[PDB]
Design a protein around this ligand. Sequence first.
Ligand SMILES: */C(=C(/C#N)C(=O)N[C@H]1CCC[C@H]1OCc1cccc(CNC(=O)c2ccc(CN3CCN(C)CC3)cc2)c1)C(C)(C)C
Lengths: 263, 11
Amino acid sequence: LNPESADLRALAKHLYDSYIKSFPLTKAKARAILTGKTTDKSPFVIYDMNSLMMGEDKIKKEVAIRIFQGCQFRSVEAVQEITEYAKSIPGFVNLDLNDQVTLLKYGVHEIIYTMLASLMNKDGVLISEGQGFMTREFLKSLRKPFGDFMEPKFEFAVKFNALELDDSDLAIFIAVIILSGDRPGLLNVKPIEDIQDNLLQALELQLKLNHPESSQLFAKLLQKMTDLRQIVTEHVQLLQVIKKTETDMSLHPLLQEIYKDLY
Amino acid sequence: RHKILHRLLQE
Ligand SMILES: */C(=C(/C#N)C(=O)N[C@H]1CCC[C@H]1OCc1cccc(CNC(=O)c2ccc(CN3CCN(C)CC3)cc2)c1)C(C)(C)C
């Protein structure tokens, strides 16, 4: 087709390459691990407290807290990977640095739950870069309110995963999320919306080309962008509850930066 | 005031 199309194809490919470089465990590998369609060693399954201790070998006082703390190391690395990815989005590093911060601050969580779905099925979630598989029931079973953290992310994941997106689709979708002009406290919305308009066009063409039999995939996917915001708000409230009722725990400083005055 | 994010972004 035309040279306008062609620029949008080139953007899609640029984002896809950069996605591949930024994120070690892609949805492609993750699904191979989960279906069994890779033929190398399976993940160690963690379904109860006993399996958790036994698995402490192959993944890196009270268990809920131990899982909480390990989840922080992973989040912090996710934020790092997402930041590197954002910096590859054409036009992003030319924005006001304060606006770059605001976009990441609000966007990283929504991207994290988007990409966590790649790691999930209805029964559990790959952890520790595909080496562990932690069951959904086990996570529900954890003592309140820790058993509340993951279940909404599973419910989201099961519906989101039905769209059958691949990495090349997700690369553009996540760039769309980051370049949201309606984040609180943005100084200069116009250059952000100019980039997002382009990304959205690129997303729409990608979905028509890559899923030509699947009409209104573009519209279904845009509606999930609001589901992601609900997950985030509910997640931050649970985090507030924990911060009050588990006085002893400490939150990693990167995560403090992000969650602050977003509570 | 987002000192880590500032550092990650300028890196
Ligand atoms: C952590 C969950 C598990 N397992 C988890 O959330 N567990 C909760 C129940 C008991 C401890 C609780 O931890 C909550 C928590 C603490 C600190 C930070 C966060 C951030 N929320 C996430 O749900 C989260 C962070 C990071 C990822 C990593 N993922 C990998 C690749 N990137 C590109 C996408 C994101 C996923 C979710 C929650 C995890 C095992 C999920 C880390």
